Structure formats: C-alpha cells, structure tokens
Amino acid sequence: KPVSLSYRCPCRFFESHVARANVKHLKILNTPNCALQIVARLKNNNRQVCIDPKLKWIQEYLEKALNK
Amino acid sequence: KPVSLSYRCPCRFFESHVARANVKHLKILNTPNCALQIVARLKNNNRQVCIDPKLKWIQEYLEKALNK
C-alpha cells in the first residue's frame, strides 16, 4: 500500500511536564488500541504535543467537562 | 468572528445524535467559563460539532484513554 496494519498511532511519544494553564484544549483521539490517545494544543507556542495520559490534572479537567 | 476576538462561548448549541464510530477525536476546550466544552471532529465530513456532555458513550470513551 505500503501495507499498514489498520490505523497507525498518531502519538508515539509523550510529554510528562505540561501545565493545565498552558493548554488551549485537549484532543482525545479515537484510536482505541493505542497506548497514547491524548494531545494538547499549547498556549505559549500554539503547537501540538502528545501528553502523559496519567497526568493527574487531566482526570480533573475531563470530570469538569462532563459536569460530573 | 475569530475565537481570539470573540467573547461568546465557542459552543452555543450542541448535538445529541453523534455516533462514536463517526468521531475522529473529541476536543475538550479549556473553557471553564462555558457550559459546553466538548467538540467532536467527525470522520466522514470533518465537521466540528459541539456535543451534549450527557452523550451516553462519552464518559467511557474518555476513561478508556486514561486507563491504558
């Protein structure tokens, strides 16, 4: 094709030190079997970086988004 | 009007019939001042749609990305 085994994972590396205050928004990619599905659009430089899905502030961020 | 220039919350209305299968990714706006923070980028038409926070499959979709 070159032959590809289904969808390729967009996020291959992640950043562990990203502050909620420096995020314009998060994108949760619909790529189920990938280890990394979270992308952050940064405020300071407007660039996208994949972020550590285990960052504690992310859980809080999403809970508020769900009005839960 | 550009988002950087508008004071109106990005999402005025929302949709309640967006199928998970037709979602490329969910963008979660870092907009705590607003009621609707979830936007879906669709696969088949690339449209951006604000969705209802109570959309059945959302919570599970988000939680899956955090438990990998």
Curated annotation (Swiss-Prot), chains A, B:
Position of sequence motif Receptor activation motif: 1-2
Reported impact of F13A: No effect on anti-HIV-1 and chemotactic activities. Slightly impaired chemotactic activity and no effect on inhibition by heparin
Positions marked as site (Important for dimer formation): H25
Residues at the site labelled Important for integrin interaction and activation: K24, K27, K43
Stated consequence of mutating K1R: Abolished CXCR4 activation ability, but only slightly impaired binding to the receptor
Result after altering K27E: Impaired CXCR4 activation. Loss of integrin activation
Effect of H25S: 55-fold reduction in binding affinity for Link domain of TNFAIP6
Protein name: SDF-1-alpha(3-67)
Included stretch of the parent chain: 22 to 89 of 93
